[PDB]
Specification:
13 strands, five-stranded parallel sheet, six-stranded mixed sheet, about 550 residues, carbohydrate derivative binding (chains A, B), 3 domains, homodimer
Chain lengths: ~550, ~550
């Protein structure tokens, strides 16, 4: 594999073997008073600041140098330029990778097969704006002539997580907008419980699916149509209550959607990089097109930062490099995203797809199997909640877990004269300090003595009360979680993932690994129908099917 | 450390070293048509069946025998009996561990300090029953004489995750009950957004906290009381609108609630094992006391299963052992919980606390520092959602990830004549089959051939289409997700966690690891006030504080 054969990697690895055990965060800060200054990036976007403080990491000047050199010798600069220019860097599918084009506010032409994609991008954006005016103003009428009060996005994966996460995060920007609902699971609970809260007269469905043949999405869409038609009793009324985000004109028409309300996107828009496209319709409907444009503008700002900035001070590049250090040298399986923001409660889940489906790969560009780790398992819950759930293990378990802590300085809800946010900030700060510093036996001993512990109880409790510390974190602090700043933040992680994939020599933009489960599911589906025993699989699959057939008739 | 010094563990590890490379799931299944029958448990609870199918794991008869021998040698059965009889097995806090007493439907005596706890457990349950009747019937009136429409649980961690996960999971059982809301984060967004949708006249607050000193919960409760009193203007009206669930009567009184308006629990109820106690009040209010009793009863059934069943046929024991195999022999950092059930959408998040806070430990009963792994990182999203997010990595990344797949046979919403559930089941079944089976180079080659691919296109695409398989899963399938069955499932995992903690020689029931973060946050709190530079910490904490102060008053 290219990474393992790379001399900059081998040097980094040998340095780790010889010196990593020596690295103590406490000592690193003690030896260097400029540590925060030299291991952080204060980004002024002109729409707020983003501070990426990576100083609480197990790195020094040499390590960062070794890491930047690796990025260079793995071709990160060339690959990035190739992405931005419309080159077909999705090499297994032979496709361009152009989520950057979707938010290319500068409108500098980006060509795919000799043709600028910007006119088409902007045409769909114009359609989205017009759509939003019609719906938000109440001008768009339902089949009984009433304004729309609820929007229901129906989609899976990239058609669901992005719009969900962003509408949750930008909820304060939704005054005057319709309520937004997300249906994704094929589990009939999801659509059934959504529809129970809705009126057919005032509900508008967005069916998000490029092919318009996605089984889960289309099944959900058809169930919605059936519920709708029970009330409307007129097939021509479907066009007032269903729109599509798709390129399959024929299938969309067949469903009963006016092809005017089919908003297009392109094969160079990956599902997990799609919220910036027509797929963001539910976002624009919820918060308004102006706020949607701001979100796009924030991403564009970060795209430019990533394109133009030298690697040593390039935010997504440094985030990528620190990850490579933890993944390929320390062997850390996971990466935690810990946003101290209740609005960002689905941020971690979003990057589970964005990161894991991108870089959960094992075949390189040459066709060779990797002989090293690739993408990590991404997880997290918002702070402070996580502190009362799993931080016990982060502080005192047996796992090394790189954590990104994120927070806005300014809250959307400065209640009680800022008291809640003061406490939230203090916890954000205290946790990374605690993870770094720990608590020494001498510090814990004084606490037990003051608590009045006997000699034997003291000695028994002492080791339990010690925190070893030396647990590395990033702290990412930003002025306020506005649409612009959120856009920047998402793009930053998109570009982190990109850099990591190049360094691993893998394709961040395909998803061949979802195919087998889809194939096998299609085979099992019709086998479940009848009463006959299924014997066509391994004994477990057969045994599980037998149990299902037996238990589905049981009356409880 | 006891585990690594144990000869049965040494035997298991050595066997793994010599032989585990030769374990191939596809081949195990082909060679043994009895595999499912011999590596699965079909439990009949008399209120539904639970099938625990562990056949798709990297084990054979010998491995299971060695694992069972290890559990015996690590004293699992004696430790279990000690838990059940009220021995103070939480040795660092010198406390009993008696969540099993909370659901002890048999009412057999369990003594702490020579005194049966059962009378007090049942007294509180009776008070819960009485209160729920008064509220749900509409008899309990607010300060303006209106029935209660909204219940708001305020609490965090163990006082939040259980009630939240259970009311979500048991949502079909809440018809006619009041709406329930969960406020947990200190982040002011959480309470602000919740209060925005409520009327003080018709809202009942439940303040849930073991200590009643938790910063987040007390601050939230004080904000709620301030909001309430702004409307009610009558301190005596607090008794109609606030109920406390605590062990700390004095702090409850201090906050401003009379013990009459307090439902108590006991120090031997760990926060993360507390939903079965007074803490489950919001569950009982939402779904009714009868359904809450059925939840307790299901846990009791599983308690009795765990207590009375030989190790080699004991469900939580076998799950625990498989985990030990993957954690301590294969070195897998994580464990994924993947319920194919939208109602169970918070099940994984609950067990992040249950598992990680219990077993994220590094000191043994002897005072030894472990030289082996302890608790895993728990994560997951419900299927099919998680399936469209991160399964790419599970199938084709570079991590071994033990997964538990869970599904009810019978759906709560059999819409479209069962079509949605049929598809859901097919996916549940196909994914584990796929993870087990994979797709060999020669199989993918033939598919590409049949697809009309050229030898040129075929050979470049081929390796990307290969699934190595041999990825182990558990499938846990149950008749229906009723309150009883859910109670049995939660207890099963509680006991898996217990068995693992015993085998690791750690205390599953303390949490010293959350203390440091709380202490450092209390120090940072006053430093945030005013405009002066903070220089008291490391340069990163100092620098983040400076950024916060600088950016506080930026008018975006």
């Amino acid at each position: 594999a290219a990474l393992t054969r790379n001399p900059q990697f081998q040097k980094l690895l040998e340095w780790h073997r010889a010196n990593s055990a020596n690295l103590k965060l406490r000592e690193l800060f003690e030896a260097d008073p400029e540590r925060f200054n030299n291991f952080s990036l204060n980004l002024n976007t002109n729409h707020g600041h983003i501070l990426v403080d990576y100083s609480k990491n197990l790195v020094n000047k040499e390590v960062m140098q070794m890491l930047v050199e690796l990025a260079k010798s793995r071709g990160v600069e060339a690959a990035r330029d190739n992405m931005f220019s419309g080159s077909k860097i999705n090499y297994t599918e032979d496709r361009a990778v152009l989520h950057v084009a979707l938010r290319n506010r500068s409108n500098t032409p980006i060509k795919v097969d000799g043709k600028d994609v910007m006119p088409e991008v902007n045409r769909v954006l114009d359609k989205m704006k017009s759509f939003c005016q019609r719906v938000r103003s109440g001008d768009w009428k339902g089949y009984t002539g009433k304004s729309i009060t609820d929007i229901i996005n129906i989609g899976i994966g990239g058609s669901d997580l992005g719009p969900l996460m962003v509408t949750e995060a930008l909820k304060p920007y939704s005054k005057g907008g319709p309520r937004v609902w997300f249906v994704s699971n094929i589990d009939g609970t999801h659509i059934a419980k959504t529809l129970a809260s809705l009126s057919p007269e005032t509900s508008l469905f967005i069916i998000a699916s490029k092919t318009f043949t996605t089984q889960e999405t289309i099944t959900n869409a058809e169930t919605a149509k059936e519920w709708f038609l029970e009330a409307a009793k007129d097939p021509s009324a479907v066009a007032k209550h269903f729109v599509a985000l798709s390129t399959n004109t024929a299938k969309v028409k067949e469903f009963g959607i006016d092809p005017q309300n089919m908003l297009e996107f392109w094969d160079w828009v990956g599902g997990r990089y799609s919220l910036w496209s027509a797929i963001g319709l539910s976002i624009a409907l919820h918060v308004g097109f102006d706020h949607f444009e701001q979100l796009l503008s924030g991403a564009h700002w970060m795209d430019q930062h990533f394109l133009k900035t030298p690697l040593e001070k390039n935010a997504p590049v440094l985030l990528a490099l620190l990850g490579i250090w933890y993944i390929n040298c320390y062997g850390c399986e996971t990466h935690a995203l810990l946003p101290y923001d209740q609005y960002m409660h689905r941020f971690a889940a979003y990057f589970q797809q964005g990161d894991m489906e991108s870089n959960g790969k094992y075949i390189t560009k040459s066709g060779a199997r990797v002989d090293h780790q690739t993408g990590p398992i991404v997880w997290g819950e918002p702070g402070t909640n996580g502190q009362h759930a799993f931080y016990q293990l982060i502080h005192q378990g047996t796992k090394m877990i790189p954590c990104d802590f994120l927070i806005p300085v300014q809250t959307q809800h400065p209640i009680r004269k800022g008291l809640h946010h003061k406490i939230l900030l203090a916890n954000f700060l205290a946790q990374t300090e605690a993870l770094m510093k720990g608590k020494l036996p001498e510090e814990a001993r004084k606490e037990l003595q003051a608590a009045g512990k006997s000699p034997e109880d003291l000695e028994k409790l002492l080791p339990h009360k010690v925190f070893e510390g030396n647990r590395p974190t990033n702290s990412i602090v930003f002025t306020k979680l506005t649409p612009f700043i959120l856009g920047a933040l998402i793009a930053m992680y998109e570009h982190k993932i990109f850099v990591q994939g190049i360094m691993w020599d893998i394709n961040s933009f395909d998803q061949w690994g979802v195919e087998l489960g889809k194939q096998l599911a299609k085979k099992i589906e019709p086998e479940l129908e009848g009463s006959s025993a299924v014997t066509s699989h391994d004994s477990s699959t057969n045994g599980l099917i037998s149990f299902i057939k037996q238990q589905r008739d049981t009356k409880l």
